[PDB]
């Protein structure tokens with residue numbers, strides 16, 4: 508059995524920064540460090556940081572006074588930010604620079620009383636944070652997931668309309684949504700393409716190349732990782748069996764019995780150690796040395812704030 512590795516895969520620049528923010532805070536101030544929501548959507552990363560004295564909480568009311576609080580990589584609403592700022596808290600913000608960029612555009616639209624449409628998935632924390640940058644009642648902020656959602660959306664002034672996207676969407680599906688928005692609202696304004704980050708784009712491109720060669724694709728990442736789910740979905744839609752797995756224990760032997768080529772990738776929040784262990788398990792089940800596929804170069808790093816060095 509041939510084992511192929513997608514490239515690129517695993518940690519992005521936002522995740523690496525957010526994790527270091529928590530680690531460095533723990534190293535500088537000791538435990539406990541409070542973190543709002545899972546810092547990134549990976550069980551292993553979260554369980555680790557929890558074992559080292561990070562405390563994860565869904566609401567700021569759970570956090571005690573005088574504490575250090577960190578915002579997760581997914582970003583937070585103005586409301587949440589103001590609720591933290593108005594209390595006895597030292598705040599560090601692990602929100603990804605590429606989410607912040609989108610937030611800044613929503614905030615601008617809010618200041619102009621000009622309506623904005625977000626493409627994304629209801630209930631996801633990035634969506635809550637991004638929608639939560641819009642406060643002006645004279646405009647409006649709308650969420651669409653599909654072309655059908657676009658087909659039933661009505662806005663107050665479609666002459667003054669802009670759109671934004673979640674960072675971790677399917678590139679292909681998002682393209683269909685934007686085509687719809689432009690047919691329904693010809694004057695809508697947006698970025699050149701969308702707000703899908705380089706890491707999401709690159710991992711989807713990489714898993715396409717992988718699924719072209721592999722019969723079965725394993726995607727390392729947690730169930731609540733949106734970007735990981737898109738990788739597995741992309742593979743499946745290409746007609747390959749694909750499985751989202753947290754770690755090597757989830758691999759069921761039937762999945763790779765009599766499979767000549769298995770591919771492995773990882774979402775943006777999945778540490779490389781999990782991939783290494785997955786590969787060790789596949790090798791127990793017959794696989795050879797893992798062959799990395801040739802990949803688009805990634806070179807971006809985001810530094811921690813100077814105060815957390």
Ligand SMILES: O=P(O)(O)OP(=O)(O)OCc1ccc(Cl)nc1
Nearest residue numbers: 547548580581633732733734776
């Ligand atoms: O569930 P998703 O959003 O894919 O989150 P993830 O698995 O934490 O991945 C890194 C990340 C962090 C922040 C953002 Cl807004 N997008 C991606």
Ligand code: F3S
Nearest residue numbers: 519521603674704775
């Ligand atoms: S938005 Fe940032 S957290 Fe990673 S998946 Fe994209 S670089």
